[PDB]
RNA sequence: CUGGU
RNA sequence: CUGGU
């Protein structure tokens, strides 16, 4: 370690910013690299077929040799989600480099590792407290503290470097009652903001809300409320990883004599890894949707997927689709524990409202406060800035919106940043004793993830996928023989280019009987009548239909 | 007229049931006829290239002579859009059957039909006062009743029947302090209740909203409030019918010394109507883009379209696309006057975001009470049900869960209705002294319009667009001839799938080879292609993609 | 409770 | 701040 110009810290954003999904952020200095979370982003913009959406790690598979450890702030989906794609990418089916997290953390991460073909012995997973300080390589002094969010054992992060104090908040709120009763420790981020904080990387998410974020504990009470006033069976859908909401719940179950049954694979493996380790308190068990069946409805309550009205979600298969044992009898209490994730809106507005239909009163915020965000609002926001003072500033797990607003946020401050910048995927970020300025960018970008596979969807089929949707397709089939015969049909294209398609085959004949003459070659035909009739069609119709001129010999 | 257990008033609505756009009420007493609106609805949820969308008509076309009077309650497209479609479908370029509606309400629509090739004097327009008595054949008294909403001269009705009132508020809310001074008045509404009400129609849009919805006069101040402190140029963007919140707007920049220019047909429309027939006051005149170019940045407020992040308009174009004059400069001020529709989220987040991107100040509820929704809210529509204390209880213009929460509204009143009726687009409602019940259905539904015409786009065109989008395209060319040739090709389908396309190949190729043995049809010989192709693709890919067997001799 | 280079 | 008959 060292000092001077030549000496910086490179902050490198693989995914998380200009968004709220697939975290992980690359900090290096000299050759060392530590990496910051493994993160998975959900779809639903415009998107069909795609389940998951992983970040572009070619920046880490070029400097695989130089990762000194993989540093895990939380459990959820968007934080680890991405590794067992990310891991054999970057090291392989095996790696002795050191993998930290909590034991919720590493106890979620092993299930996912073992269920994509993955020994957790191949990889090396060391267990650290939330609050622990560990050392990574020569250069990063990694001191970890407790934050309150929406899964137990989530930390922040003080990175110290040779250079200065780098303050990382991790996702977090300043929940002062959370439900397993372990608050946000403020001491190591008090006690850096004395020293003096060079850079802070803080959680954007509601940056643009003001006041404070409700309690766990306040949801908890309003939950029990409800499901105590409830009639018949009561059914429940959070987000999978909330396991402290998942508590809330069974608390209430157990509170007006109620047995809990689970649905759902997302929330059985969280929930079953989560009651392994000590996480989730059960008086009694978690009962299989068969051996509920027979109770009778004031003593049935079933928690489930589906709070954004996935298609093939257990909340869904209730509504429209259909389920086994499990359908909406009219009576029947559905609490949505959960809020519309922006562009999920209408998914989950459909879904109440067949709901609804079905004889169900379906409960759901703002009318009840069942659901509280895991992300600190403007006043913890600006406790965290007091508490820091940086010199830099970074807004970070938010969209362009939220990061200006924690920018504006930082300006109103006794004592603002020197500097504020806004966090993109893919730059790279130079961080020195007095400065802090964008210098590069790497490759980056995502990758579609099915159940068939990472990368069975690319851009290409989608930007396509999008052609067939907007405008349709147009399918021109020429023999490029002695007798020539040209047979144009179409799907999904409007009736005054589907009455135009007889001057298409006309269209095409032209170009055949010039392609066969000056004895072209087919791949020169094809470009021969795709051109005019993509000129023809958008000077008759407006429209830009996908043309496919197939031609054979 | 008459009574006894014969007599009966029967309710059709053709739209405006279980949703909140294409409003169009169907009102029959024996062998009269009247009609309460003809409205258009938007898409949104998984239609593209639909621009507008039209209820069908068919109990109109085929009762088109038993029409006595077409009743319109206001101005928006909801309301009056659909009718130059309407009109010609069911009279034709011409009819005497009177058009009764407000001054501007039939200022808008003769605007609407003159655009369409048809002529304001073709049909019979005639002129009410919002609070207008009128005679609709021999069995219908309609009392029009003043309810403010977000377009002027809007209005409810009382329906007097043979054998009993009906009332309809039509679109409204409780505003004490409108725009244009002009309250809602409850006289009739309240002279109803007194004599007896046997059926309420009441505006559901709001009925899981608690409180009171807040004035135009107080989103005015607002929106005076957050221009007064703006540094540059001011972007409005609000629905193109809210005349009243485009007053706000006009009357904000006059007081700061700006100058108003409108771009955008939608928003131009209806402001050349408003300002022509002394519904908009604007102190200066309303200015061209060009004109206000090189004036100063403190003197320029731009009105413009683009509230719902819509891809064609001004504020879309000024994020995304790009415009003549128009250029999203470092240190502007965007204000969203509206709110985002369920389903249209994501396109004003994404806008929003981008708008940001562009040194913007991009302001908006509910940080910034800059909108209020024109609908009632619990305490308005209670004051309502108190007002009139109907025996039957009919919730329109919302959807499930709207009309469901109204119902329990309703049922928690001191002297609740007999009954309440869920109302569904296409029922018929059957309506005597002591029932009120569904006993029928008529053919119904909806058609889709776009720039090249009415039905342009079909159901099936959509449904197969889908297909395209969710699963891909598989084009399978075989060649039915003494030398058979199978070439199949693909568009957005999987790579897993795009791997088995060489089977695909040999898979036709067996299924030609047995169509020439046999001699069968080329209509056969792609069935014996298409089934077999279909279930290889189900077991190896899970997939359903859309499979195009072309048979060509 | 929506648009139309 | 999301799923997986
Ligand atoms: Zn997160
Ligand atoms: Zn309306």
Redo the contacts with the bound molecule.
């Keep these: 370690s060292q000092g001077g110009p030549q000496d910086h810290v490179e902050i490198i954003p693989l995914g998380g910013m200009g968004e709220?999904?697939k975290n992980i952020t690359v900090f290096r200095f000299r050759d060392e690299i530590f990496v910051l979370d493994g993160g998975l982003a959900?779809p639903?913009e415009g998107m069909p077929g795609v389940?998951?959406l992983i970040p572009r790690v070619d920046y880490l598979i070029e400097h695989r040799h130089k990762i000194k450890a993989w540093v895990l702030t939380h459990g959820?989906?968007?934080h680890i989600g991405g590794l067992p794609f990310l891991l054999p990418m970057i090291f392989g089916k095996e790696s002795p480099v050191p993998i930290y997290g909590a034991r919720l953390t590493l106890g979620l991460l092993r299930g996912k590792l073992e269920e994509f073909g993955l020994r957790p012995g191949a990889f090396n997973l060391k267990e650290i407290s939330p609050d622990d300080r560990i050392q990574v390589g020569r250069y990063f002094t990694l001191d970890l503290f407790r934050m309150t969010h929406?899964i137990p054992d989530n930390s922040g992060v003080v990175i110290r470097t040779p250079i200065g104090t780098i303050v990382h908040t991790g996702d977090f709120k300043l929940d002062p009652t959370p439900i397993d009763g372990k608050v946000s420790h403020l001491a190591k981020v008090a006690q850096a903001g004395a020293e003096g904080v060079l850079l802070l990387i803080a959680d954007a998410?509601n940056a643009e809300r003001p006041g404070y974020t409700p309690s766990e504990m306040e949801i908890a009470k309003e939950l029990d409320r409800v499901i105590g006033r409830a009639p018949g069976r009561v059914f429940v859908t959070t987000?999978?990883?909330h396991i402290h909401r998942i508590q809330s719940v069974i608390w209430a179950a157990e509170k007006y004599g109620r047995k809990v049954a689970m649905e759902?694979?997302?929330?059985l493996?969280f929930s079953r890894i989560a009651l392994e380790l000590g996480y989730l308190k059960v008086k009694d068990r978690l009962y299989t949707l068969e051996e509920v069946k027979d109770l009778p409805d004031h003593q049935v309550l079933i928690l489930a997927?589906?709070?954004?009205g996935?298609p093939?979600?257990?909340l869904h298969?209730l509504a429209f689709?259909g389920?086994?044992k499990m359908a909406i009898k009219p009576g029947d209490t559905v609490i949505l524990s959960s809020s519309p994730?922006?562009?999920?809106e209408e998914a989950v507005n459909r879904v109440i409202n067949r709901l609804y239909a079905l004889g169900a009163y379906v409960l759901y915020p703002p009318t009840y406060k069942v659901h509280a965000?895991?992300?600190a609002s403007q006043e913890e926001l600006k406790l965290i800035l007091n508490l820091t003072t940086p010199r830099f500033f970074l807004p970070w797990h938010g969209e362009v919106r939220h990061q200006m607003n924690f920018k504006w946020l930082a300006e109103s401050m006794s004592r603002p940043p020197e500097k504020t910048l806004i966090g993109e995927n893919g730059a790279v970020y130079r961080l020195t004793r007095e400065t802090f300025e964008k210098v590069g960018e790497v490759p980056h970008g995502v990758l579609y993830v099915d159940?068939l596979g990472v990368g069975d969807i690319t851009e290409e089929i989608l930007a396509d996928r999008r052609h067939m949707a907007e405008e349709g397709l147009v399918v021109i089939t020429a023999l490029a023989g002695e007798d020539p015969v040209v047979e144009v049909v179409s799907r999904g294209f409007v009736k005054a280019g589907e009455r135009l398609l007889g001057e298409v085959r006309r269209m095409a004949l032209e170009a055949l009987k010039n392609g066969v003459r000056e004895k072209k070659p087919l791949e020169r035909i094809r470009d021969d009548i795709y051109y005019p009739v993509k000129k023809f069609l958008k000077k008759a119709t407006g429209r830009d239909p996908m043309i496919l001129p197939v031609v054979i010999e």
Tied chains: 1, 2.
Excluded: C, Y
């Design positions: 709220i999904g959900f639903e389940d998951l959820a989906e968007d929406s998410t987000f999978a990883s759902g694979r997302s929330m493996k997927t589906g709070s954004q996935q093939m979600s257990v298969r689709e389920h086994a994730i922006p562009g999920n965000s895991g992300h159940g």
